[PDB]
Design an enzyme around this catalytic site. Structure first.
Site, PDB file in Angstrom:
ATOM      1  N   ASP A  62       2.384   8.984  12.565  1.00 21.95           N
ATOM      2  CA  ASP A  62       3.472   9.510  11.732  1.00 21.95           C
ATOM      3  C   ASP A  62       4.168  10.736  12.333  1.00 21.95           C
ATOM      4  OD1 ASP A  62       3.264   7.468   9.888  1.00 21.95           O
ATOM      5  OD2 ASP A  62       1.946   8.588   8.530  1.00 21.95           O
ATOM      6  N   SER A  89       8.697   0.870   3.345  1.00 24.65           N
ATOM      7  CA  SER A  89       7.780   0.183   2.448  1.00 24.65           C
ATOM      8  C   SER A  89       6.729  -0.501   3.307  1.00 24.65           C
ATOM      9  CB  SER A  89       8.551  -0.843   1.629  1.00 24.65           C
ATOM     10  OG  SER A  89       7.712  -1.486   0.703  1.00 24.65           O
ATOM     11  N   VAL A  90       5.464  -0.426   2.900  1.00 27.99           N
ATOM     12  CA  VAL A  90       4.350  -0.846   3.757  1.00 27.99           C
ATOM     13  C   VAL A  90       3.381  -1.802   3.072  1.00 27.99           C
ATOM     14  CG1 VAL A  90       2.378  -0.092   5.095  1.00 27.99           C
ATOM     15  CG2 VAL A  90       4.420   1.375   4.911  1.00 27.99           C
ATOM     16  N   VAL A 108       0.815  -1.208   0.000  1.00 32.26           N
ATOM     17  CA  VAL A 108       0.000   0.000   0.000  1.00 32.26           C
ATOM     18  C   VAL A 108       0.852   1.264   0.000  1.00 32.26           C
ATOM     19  CG1 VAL A 108      -1.991  -1.078   1.113  1.00 32.26           C
ATOM     20  CG2 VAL A 108      -0.195  -0.022   2.506  1.00 32.26           C
TER      21      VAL A 108
END
Lengths: 339, 8
Positions: free
Chosen positions: A165, A34-35, A27
């Site tokens: 975040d 990186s997710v 995603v």
């Protein structure tokens, strides 16, 4: 003890994660890492599994990795994203290279919420209340978010909100003027400025200070809140910044009630207290929670503070392998939250 | 608690 891991390539990236994480779907990625979204069969939750990119490629990156993991491990509050899990497929320090962080993948962000409906004043009260509740907790540990904006707020169908975040460095529309042009050291109330910007936008349907560059944005800000007076100028360290500010045509503060007509006057009053140019004079998160706007939500016995957060590591000067080893220790010492 | 549509 050690789970069973399984290994798969997805979009030219290797993911080796415990089998408790299933149905990984990429995603997004970036400089950070990186997710993948996944289903966490242990908690029954949808989660974001972030694989850090090059976590230990330099002193700088290794320290940032440590900083992020220390911060995430400390946050335990209903309105702040917490660490569900952190793992490495490595069996020892010597083979330690990869770090994976797991967090709740909750609802949608505030922008997407606004895209699909019109918020009521009750929504705005409850959403801003929770942001400030989270901030009271963060600020009480002397943590500053630094990067609050709608895309950093997760919201679910019960309007429950979490801040995520955190800014890890040591748009621009939500940023306090003193940090945008580096006028002085950040205090916690840079986050309060951001909240003011977010709330204004929730009330009006328009970004408050949508400047195209730093100067344009400063001008829009100063037009609302007035140009700095002598007292504030004294606190600006850069002689050049001071000279520039003094070069501007002076402008009075505007009457916010004219700028936000038809909004709850208590909302406008709170905005006046958040969007003050001098950061020492902005309302704190704790004080804002007691503000009359939030009378239906405020509960002084249910607005907890954090354990103290030791940031002395920030002034340590260590080798790459030393930051990496400290990081490994934190992976090892991690205890998940109650299920 | 107020309710919300989650896209989409």
């Amino acid at each position: 003890e050690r789970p069973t891991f399984y290994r798969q390539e997805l979009n030219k990236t290797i993911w080796e994660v415990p089998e408790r994480y299933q149905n990984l779907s990429p995603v997004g990625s970036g400089a950070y890492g990186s997710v993948c979204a996944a289903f966490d069969t242990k908690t029954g939750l949808r989660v974001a599994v972030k694989k850090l990119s090059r976590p230990f490629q330099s002193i700088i990156h290794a320290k940032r990795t440590y900083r992020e993991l220390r911060l995430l491990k400390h946050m335990k509050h209903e309105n702040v994203i917490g660490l569900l899990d952190v793992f490495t497929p490595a069996r020892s320090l010597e083979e330690f290279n990869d770090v994976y962080l797991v967090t709740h993948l909750m609802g949608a962000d505030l922008n997407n919420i606004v895209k699909c409906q019109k918020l009521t004043d009750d929504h705005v009260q409850f959403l801003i209340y929770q942001i400030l509740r989270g901030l009271k907790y963060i600020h009480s540990a002397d943590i500053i978010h630094r990067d609050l904006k709608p895309s950093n707020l997760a919201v679910n169908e019960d309007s429950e909100l979490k801040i995520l975040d955190f800014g890890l460095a040591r748009t621009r529309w939500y940023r306090a003027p003193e940090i945008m042009l580096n006028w002085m050291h950040y205090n916690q109330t840079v986050d309060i400025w951001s909240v003011g910007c977010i709330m204004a936008e929730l009330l009006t349907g328009r970004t408050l200070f949508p400047g195209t560059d730093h100067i344009d944005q400063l001008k829009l800000i100063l037009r609302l809140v007035g140009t700095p007076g002598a007292e504030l100028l004294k606190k600006i360290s850069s002689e050049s910044a001071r000279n520039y500010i003094q070069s501007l045509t002076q402008m009075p503060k505007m009457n916010f009630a004219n700028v936000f007509i038809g909004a709850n006057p208590l909302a406008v009053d709170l905005l006046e207290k958040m969007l003050v140019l001098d950061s020492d004079k902005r309302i704190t998160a704790a004080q804002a929670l007691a503000h009359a706007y939030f009378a239906q939500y405020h509960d002084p016995d249910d607005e907890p503070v954090a354990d103290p957060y030791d940031q002395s590591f920030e002034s340590r000067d260590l080798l790459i392998d030393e930051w990496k080893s400290l990081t490994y220790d934190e992976v090892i010492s991690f205890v998940p939250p109650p299920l | 608690n107020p309710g919300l549509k989650i896209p989409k």
